[PDB]
Each structure stands twice: as structure tokens, then as C-alpha cells.
Ligand binder design. Structure first.
Ligand SMILES: [Ca+2]
Ligand SMILES: [Ca+2]
Ligand SMILES: [Ca+2]
Ligand SMILES: [Ca+2]
Ligand SMILES: [Ca+2]
Ligand SMILES: [Ca+2]
Length: 181
């Protein structure tokens, strides 16, 4: 075995990249260009920067923090929402407080309302808060686990875990039939 990492933010910040990271914890920043970022194993921190970025968190509890208000957002000019390949909605988290919103919008089961492209292709998650300038937050996911997304893994509560976990999904009811045929 021989290390010699070609990834990490050390190279290609302002232009399109292919960064393959280590099997340990890292801070990954894409910078400019449509980057292909791969965090792999370890608890990683990931920012995309300018452009529509394609990114994997990999194994470990990852933090998709993003750079500024100008990252993973939509504006009247067009969308710049990033494209996450393998987000784990149980283990990983996505920050949005400094860049998008602090109060979650419309949604149910402790979530934000999800969207799909069609029968296939990517799924999306949207925030329904926007700036008066039309700067809103949306992000695309191609793992198609929209059915498991929750606002619990969307971190706007300053990473404080004193609250949350409030669910009322539990329950049972029925209308039984009694045929004799
Ligand atoms: Ca780059
Ligand atoms: Ca980028
Ligand atoms: Ca890593
Ligand atoms: Ca980006
Ligand atoms: Ca990882
Ligand atoms: Ca992960």
C-alpha cells in the first residue's frame, strides 16, 4: 500500500476538477468550476463553491456545509444547486443556516417537501424560503432516497441536539370486512 493523494483542496481551486480523497477525515473545497468531488471513507466536510458540483460523501458521517450564499442555491439567473451522489439521510448532514435559511418551510413528517425529475433521473430537495432578490435554496440528489429525507439532517440549529426528534408517525387504525363467499 502506498499513499499519494491526488485529491484535497490543494490543487485546481478555480477550475473543473476530479478530486479523489483519502480514507480519513478531510475538509474538501471545490472552488470554481464544475468539480467532481469524492470524499470516500472518514467523517468529511464538503464545500462545492461556484458551479454545479457533483459530489460524494462516502462512508462516515459527512457535513455538506457549502461555501457562501452563492453556493448550492438558485437565483433569477438560473440554478446552481449542487448534485450529491450518495447522501446518507441518517448519518450525514447538510448545513444551510449561513447560506440559505434558519427556519424550515413547508413539509411533513419532520421534513421539507421533496421533488423528483420524472420516473427516473435525479431527485431534489427544496427550501421554500427565498431572499427578496429571488435567491432560494435547492439541491439535487441522484441516490433517489427522497423517500427517506428529513429536515433532521438539515442543520440549521447550530449543530445543537437538545431539541428535534419530534415525530408523530406512530399509529394504527383499520376498517375490516367480513366476507362469507
Ligand atoms: Ca475546482
Ligand atoms: Ca465548484
Ligand atoms: Ca475522506
Ligand atoms: Ca456549487
Ligand atoms: Ca466520508
Ligand atoms: Ca456518508
Amino acid at each position: 500500500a502506498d499513499p499519494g493523494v491526488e485529491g484535497t483542496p490543494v490543487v485546481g481551486s478555480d477550475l473543473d476538477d476530479e478530486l479523489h480523497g483519502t480514507l480519513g477525515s478531510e475538509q474538501i473545497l471545490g472552488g470554481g468550476g464544475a468539480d467532481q468531488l469524492y470524499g470516500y471513507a472518514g467523517n468529511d466536510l464538503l464545500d462545492g463553491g461556484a458551479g454545479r458540483d457533483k459530489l460524494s460523501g462516502g462512508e462516515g458521517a459527512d457535513t455538506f456545509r457549502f461555501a457562501l450564499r452563492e453556493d448550492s442555491h438558485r437565483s433569477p439567473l438560473g440554478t446552481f444547486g449542487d448534485r450529491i451522489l450518495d447522501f446518507d439521510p441518517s448519518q450525514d448532514r447538510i448545513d444551510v443556516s449561513a447560506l440559505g435559511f434558519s427556519g424550515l418551510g413547508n413539509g411533513y413528517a419532520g421534513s421539507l417537501a421533496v421533488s423528483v425529475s420524472d420516473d427516473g433521473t435525479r431527485t431534489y430537495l427544496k427550501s421554500y424560503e427565498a431572499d427578496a432578490q429571488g435567491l432560494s435554496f435547492e439541491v439535487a440528489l441522484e441516490g433517489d432516497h427522497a423517500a427517506a429525507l428529513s429536515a433532521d439532517n438539515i442543520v440549521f440549529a447550530a449543530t445543537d441536539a437538545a431539541a428535534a426528534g419530534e415525530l408523530g408517525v406512530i399509529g394504527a387504525s383499520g376498517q375490516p370486512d367480513d366476507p362469507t363467499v
